[PDB]
């Protein structure tokens, strides 16, 4: 028993990463096979990070410009190009420490784990959501540009994430392994809105089933409701609308607690009718979304 | 900016997990050099862990009934010995993935991650305290055991906890490294009373510093305290006593901030008295004791 928030064994994904530097700015790569990728911002100064023009700034440099180096040893570039926001470094030697991989674009809502990473380096390992605003509320200071988010099934890593930004209001922006931002984000040092966010309605729901499971059931009640009477209320309190994909991915948890989903929604409609009146739920005091039901599942399963 | 619970990268932990099996028991096992660490409780059966007498229980075994085995590959086990609430199972080969290491016995209060494994295989990764009551309030199900908590200073790993056992409360026990359970405790499935625990003060006024440094300010007032005073309020909130060797390691996040410790104190003393009044502070609605002033420092100045 216990519930918490747990991050994958990071081991797979510290073997991969890697320092990149060009000119005066330094951040983190990631090297699978005889590629390195890195955040395409990597090639510019302070002067033209408010609004560069990658393609110009990126034909000033050549394979000899980008330094790749992995712990003490030296990589050799032979190619380089930009595809979307990142950069794809080819060397002349295939990471021997290359796990199984893929490269995967996630859903927002859904989670994964962070290692941080500054020259290259693990700092440290958290599990995070993407916000159904597609910003993540990370832990990064300057340098951990090219972190990588990833998740793991069994010896496949999946690579979701990988650090670009800041936003001025202190939660972080990123792309997808191909370079895409996830949100409307740009990778320039401009006021960037990212939108209203939402709770996460799965995913508290999925958290409320690993409370019962975990013997925190003060509240559990005599009440029911509908998916259109529950969806007023997420609607009044910025939830996420639940659908009957979200009851149906639920349903494990359902089958295992004998809690039916429209049962839990009731629940979850007093909590945010009623809030807490100063109780926890598995160490908490305000409703848990970094969880999804896979999560709860896998963490009370004990899978590896 | 941000600030996350944020666990050392496992990767050198993970090269040392192995699988051990006694009879019908596996469990996991620490495999460092040509040692391999587990809790003595794998050569206990069902009908024996209510009152077990680990003396005459392993003479009954020989070093071919211990089964070790790191991936796939099977080690030859050489010697065996028990000492205090672990065995030592001596293999003829030296683990090649071995890091530099440590074996340290944590104070209370102080934090480390966990390494969850299951069948030698790691499952998750997060970061807890030692509860001043000697618990740790971790996510183990049946074959956790033999899980290991860590700290990471640059190359070096310094072992601090191996996972023996969930008490009938749900909070989790265990050992140092020279299987000196933390607590009282004991290896034996028995009613066994943890003791009152208490919040971690120091922990609580670093994260205070931490949320100051990371933009949540709303909670800093126009009052200063003393230590007697505070003490007071602490004692009343079933808080630890704060000594003048907590003010000094909070030192350098007085300095950063310009935050003199007793004013934050003081806004400690108004946050037990008055509550959140339905705010948060670093995305929590509660006071939370589970970073050290060294964790804040270490995540505020990104050390890898
Ligand atoms: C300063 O504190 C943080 C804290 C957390 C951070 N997460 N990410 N970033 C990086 C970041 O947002 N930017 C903004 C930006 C502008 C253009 C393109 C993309 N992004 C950034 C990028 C590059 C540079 C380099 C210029 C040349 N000299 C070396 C730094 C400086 C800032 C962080 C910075
Ligand atoms: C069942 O769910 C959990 C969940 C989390 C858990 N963390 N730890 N433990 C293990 C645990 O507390 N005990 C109690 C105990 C008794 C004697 C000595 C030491 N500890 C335990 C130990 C060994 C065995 C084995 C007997 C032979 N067959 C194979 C299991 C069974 C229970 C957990 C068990």
């Known amino acids: 028993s216990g519930f918490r928030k747990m991050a994958f064994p990071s081991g797979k994904v510290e073997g991969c990463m890697v320092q990149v530097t060009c000119g005066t700015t330094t951040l983190n790569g990631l090297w699978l096979d005889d590629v390195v990728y890195c955040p395409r911002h990597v090639i510019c100064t302070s002067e033209d990070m408010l609004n560069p023009n990658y393609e110009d700034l990126l034909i000033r440099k050549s394979n000899?410009?980008?330094?790749?180096?992995?712990?003490?040893?030296?990589?050799?570039?032979?190619?380089?190009?930009?595809?979307?926001?990142?950069?794809?470094?080819?060397?002349?030697?295939?990471?021997?420490?290359?796990?199984?991989?893929?490269?995967?674009?996630?859903?927002?809502?859904?989670?994964?784990?962070?290692?941080?990473?500054?020259?290259?380096?693990?700092?440290?390992?958290?599990?995070?959501?993407?916000?159904?605003?597609?910003?993540?509320?990370?832990?990064?200071?300057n340098g951990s540009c090219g972190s990588v988010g990833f998740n793991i099934d069994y010896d496949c890593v999946s690579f979701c994430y990988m650090h670009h930004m800041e936003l001025p209001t202190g939660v972080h922006a990123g792309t997808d392994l191909e370079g895409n931002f996830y949100g409307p984000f740009?990778?320039?040092?401009?006021?960037?809105?990212?939108?209203?966010?939402?709770?996460?309605?799965?995913?508290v729901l999925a958290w409320l089933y690993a409370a019962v499971i975990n013997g925190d059931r003060w509240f559990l009640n005599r009440f029911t409701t509908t998916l259109n009477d529950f969806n007023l209320v997420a609607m009044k309190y910025n939830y996420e609308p639940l659908t009957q994909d979200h009851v149906d991915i639920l349903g494990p948890l359902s089958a295992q607690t004998g809690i039916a989903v429209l049962d839990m929604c009731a629940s979850l409609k007093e909590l945010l009718q009623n809030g807490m009146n100063g109780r926890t739920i598995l160490g908490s005091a305000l409703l848990e979304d970094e969880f999804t039901p896979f999560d709860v599942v896998r963490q009370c399963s004990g899978v590896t």
Do not use: E, W
């Open 186 to 203: 740009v990778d320039r040092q401009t006021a960037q809105a990212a939108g209203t966010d939402t709770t996460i309605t799965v995913n």
């Open 64 to 141: 000899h410009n980008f330094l790749v180096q992995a712990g003490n040893v030296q990589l050799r570039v032979i190619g380089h190009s930009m595809q979307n926001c990142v950069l794809k470094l080819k060397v002349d030697t295939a990471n021997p420490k290359t796990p199984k991989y893929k490269f995967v674009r996630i859903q927002p809502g859904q989670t994964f784990s962070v290692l941080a990473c500054y020259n290259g380096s693990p700092s440290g390992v958290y599990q995070c959501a993407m916000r159904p605003n597609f910003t993540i509320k990370g832990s990064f200071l």
